[PDB]
């Protein structure tokens, strides 16, 4: 049972490089617009405390160097929407897929196509943490990389990368430029709220483990939804809602293990630990598979 | 840090479906040839003791349905190379990347583009285990899915998927149709040999720990390669080759820690416990990161 990302071809065809002065990052080229983080307009000193409206009014179209592969795209207009820059170019992207911009909820997962200098480097799965950070793998030059999901032929962009926090987790925006969480695109020390574990994802992962024949954690204890949530909150786990119980339905039907019975198993794992044992090869409870991810891969 | 698949766009542009009768799997369309597992020509009941030579002599070009989506590609030639069928088609794939066919070593990693009916569904990183199985995620209809690496612009194809073993692990061929390991494309009882830990990959992960400042496990000892190999086998670890010592070279130089000094530190971790301590946030030693995976992820190769 592997973390599986969506195939990245439809997004690779949209990645371009954007440069102002000596700052380079990636942009997303859809039709005749390039989207990219607005701090590409910042000098290093600017990043320390940027007034973005002041910085942008002092820029001209020709200050923006956009390159798709080797070919420069001429910028013929620009505007700012929250923390993203929209650069109008004189060329439409022939590889533009069917797409939408979405704002995802904490606990939901998405694929990240990490790019440098407008070129794709790697693909992997993430989840929006409850504290609105993401545990990514991003280096210098990765800003403008996007997170996405794919449904039929339609790409749902949900994330664009802006920054790394001092703990090593990452922060970014939706494609309307609004940050996930209480962060700002300024180079200054920023902490996140206390993170919590995505409970419904842990349960779905436990179902995946049972589907693969790893059952040592199951028990015959019973629990009400409320009593499970009390223990969950005590251990910094997110509350389980009845809709969460409902979306776990298909997995409970396939395994013959009632959702609340899987809650009883998890509750004992939280109170006793995993001893020295593993689940699906993991020494920790994994919470970045949604119920949909598990069903998608195990059925 | 995490496992990272290569961008799959170059391979996605090469996936097609191949059907004989009601048996459909995936094929790889490069230039004017489609490569796919030869058991597509098997009826459900002939997979028990298939005579592939006699099944293929019954087939003509017009029995093969090759589709890029719903667009049919005309087959103009067919031949069998080991366990792979090569179907010549009348159209050269305009999306053919620069490519090569490679046969990889146990321990080497690769991305897998899992496909169904020629439609890509997901991408993930896999390692070839020392027992020549891979711990994949393959369902019915995934055969013909390929595994690959990308270096600059060139796709090295190294795996094509054929079968699942009783323990839920998977087996397949290189793109010349030669199985990895002692497996055969027959629906009979087969079993993976007992697996071992990929020592060169564990060492790469230790180097990655050191690069990140996590170095409590460095000791003041060294060892010889031969003594380390003999001890490692006692813990079900693979022995190191001279090539293994050399591909750790870049990480040894970056950290300043000699390969054999890192071998002695790992030997201590094997003989003693981890003392309830962690390495890169893990109580387990990771063995599915090659030296190349460490470099490319730690320095962001495109």
Q: Which residues of B are catalytic?
A: 39, 143
* Residue A204 distance to chain B (closest CA, Å): 17
Pairwise CA distance, residues B285 & B107, whole Å = 14
Pairwise CA distance, residues B297 & B300, whole Å = 5
Which of the four CATH numbers 3.10.20.340, 3.90.1150.10, 3.40.50.150, 1.10.1840.10 does domain B199-299 have? 1.10.1840.10
Comparing alpha-carbon positions, the chain B residue that sits nearest to A117 is B302
Query: Where do the structural domains in chain A lie, given as residue ranges?
Result: 9-173, 199-298
> Quick one: CATH architecture of A199-298?
Orthogonal Bundle (1.10)
Q: Give the end-to-end CA distance of chain A in Å, rounded to a whole number.
A: 12
Pairwise CA distance, residues B14 & B32, whole Å = 11
Residue of A2, A150, A168 to mutate, testing the B interface (most B Cβ within 10 Å of its Cβ):
A2
CATH number corresponding to A9-173: 2.40.10.10
Q: Contact, B11 vs B146, CB < 8 A?
A: yes
Using CB atoms within 10 A of its CB, is residue A70 exposed (0-12), middle (13-18) or buried (19+)? exposed
Q: Give the end-to-end CA distance of chain B in Å, rounded to a whole number.
A: 18
Which chain B residues touch A213 with a CB distance below 8 Å? Answer: 168
Q: Contact, B71 vs B126, CB < 8 A?
A: no
Quick one: tokens of B1?
Answer: 């840090």
* Residue B6 distance to chain A (closest CA, Å): 5
Q: Which of A107, A101, A114, A199 is nearest to A149 (CA)?
A: A101
Using CB atoms within 10 A of its CB, is residue B165 exposed (0-12), middle (13-18) or buried (19+)? middle
Report the phi/psi class of residue B31: left, alpha or beta, with left for phi > 0 and alpha for psi in -120 to 50: left
Q: Contact, B267 vs B231, CB < 8 A?
A: yes
Quick one: tokens of B38?
Answer: 């030869």
Q: Which residues of A are catalytic?
A: 39, 143
Residues 6 or more apart in contact with residue B177 via CB below 8 angstroms = B38, B80, B81, B82, B83, B84
Quick one: tokens of B56?
Answer: 């293929």
Pairwise CA distance, residues A148 & A5, whole Å = 10
A12 has a chain B CB within 8 A of its CB:
yes
Q: Contact, B113 vs B9, CB < 8 A?
A: no
Quick one: tokens of B75?
Answer: 């087959």
Pairwise CA distance, residues B50 & B36, whole Å = 17
Using CB atoms within 10 A of its CB, is residue B117 exposed (0-12), middle (13-18) or buried (19+)? middle
B5 has a chain A CB within 8 A of its CB:
yes
Pairwise CA distance, residues A294 & A250, whole Å = 10
Indicate the residue of B4, B123, B296 with minimum beta-carbon distance to A7.
Answer: B123
Using CB atoms within 10 A of its CB, is residue B115 exposed (0-12), middle (13-18) or buried (19+)? buried
Please indicate the experimental technique that yielded this structure. X-ray
Q: Contact, B32 vs B91, CB < 8 A?
A: yes
A181 has a chain B CB within 8 A of its CB:
no
Residues of B (260-279) whose Cβ lies below 8 Å from A: none
Q: What is the resolution of this structure in A?
A: 1.9
Pairwise CA distance, residues B137 & B122, whole Å = 10
With H, G, I as helix, E, B as strand and everything else as coil, classify residue B247: helix
Strand A98-101 versus strand A154-164 pairing type: parallel
* Residue B133 distance to chain A (closest CA, Å): 15
Task: Name the E strands within chain A.
Answer: 15-20, 23-30, 33-37, 65-68, 71-73, 75-81, 84-89, 98-101, 109-116, 119-127, 146-151, 154-164, 170-173
Please, how many CA atoms are within 13 Å of residue B186, restricted to the half-sphere of its CB?
A: 11
Cβ–Cβ pairs < 8 A, chains A and B: 93
Residue ranges of alpha helices (H) inside chain A are 9-12, 44-48, 52-57, 199-211, 225-234, 242-247, 249-255, 259-272, 291-298
């Amino acid at each position: 049972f592997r973390k599986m990302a969506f195939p990245s071809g439809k997004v690779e065809g949209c990645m371009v490089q954007v440069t102002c002065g000596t700052t380079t990052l990636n942009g997303l080229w859809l039709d005749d617009v390039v989207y990219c983080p607005r701090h590409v307009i910042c000098t290093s000193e600017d990043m320390l405390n940027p007034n973005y409206e002041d910085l942008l009014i002092r820029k001209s179209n020709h200050n923006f160097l956009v390159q798709a592969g080797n070919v420069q795209l001429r910028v013929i207009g620009h505007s700012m929407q929250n923390c993203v820059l929209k650069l109008k170019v004189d060329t439409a992207n022939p590889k533009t897929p069917k797409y939408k911009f979405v704002r995802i909820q904490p606990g939901q997962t998405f694929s990240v196509l990490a790019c440098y200098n407008g070129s794709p480097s790697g693909v992997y799965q993430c989840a929006m943490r409850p504290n609105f950070t993401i545990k990514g793998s991003f280096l210098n030059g990765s800003c403008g990389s996007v997170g996405f999901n794919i449904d039929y032929d339609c790409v749902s962009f949900c994330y664009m990368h802006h920054m790394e926090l001092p703990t090593g987790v990452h922060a970014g925006t939706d494609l309307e430029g609004n940050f996930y969480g209480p962060f700002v695109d300024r180079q200054t020390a920023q902490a996140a709220g206390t993170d919590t574990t995505i409970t419904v994802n842990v349960l779905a992962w436990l179902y995946a483990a049972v589907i693969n024949g790893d059952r040592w954690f199951l028990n015959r204890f019973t629990t009400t939804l409320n009593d499970f949530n009390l223990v969950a909150m005590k251990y910094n786990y997110e509350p389980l809602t009845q809709d969460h119980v409902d979306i776990l339905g298909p997995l409970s039907a396939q395994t013959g293990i009632a959702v609340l019975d899987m809650c009883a198993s998890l509750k004992e794992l939280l109170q006793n630990g995993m001893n020295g044992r593993t689940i699906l090869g993991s020494a920790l409870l994994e919470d970045e598979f949604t119920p949909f991810d598990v069903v998608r891969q195990c059925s």
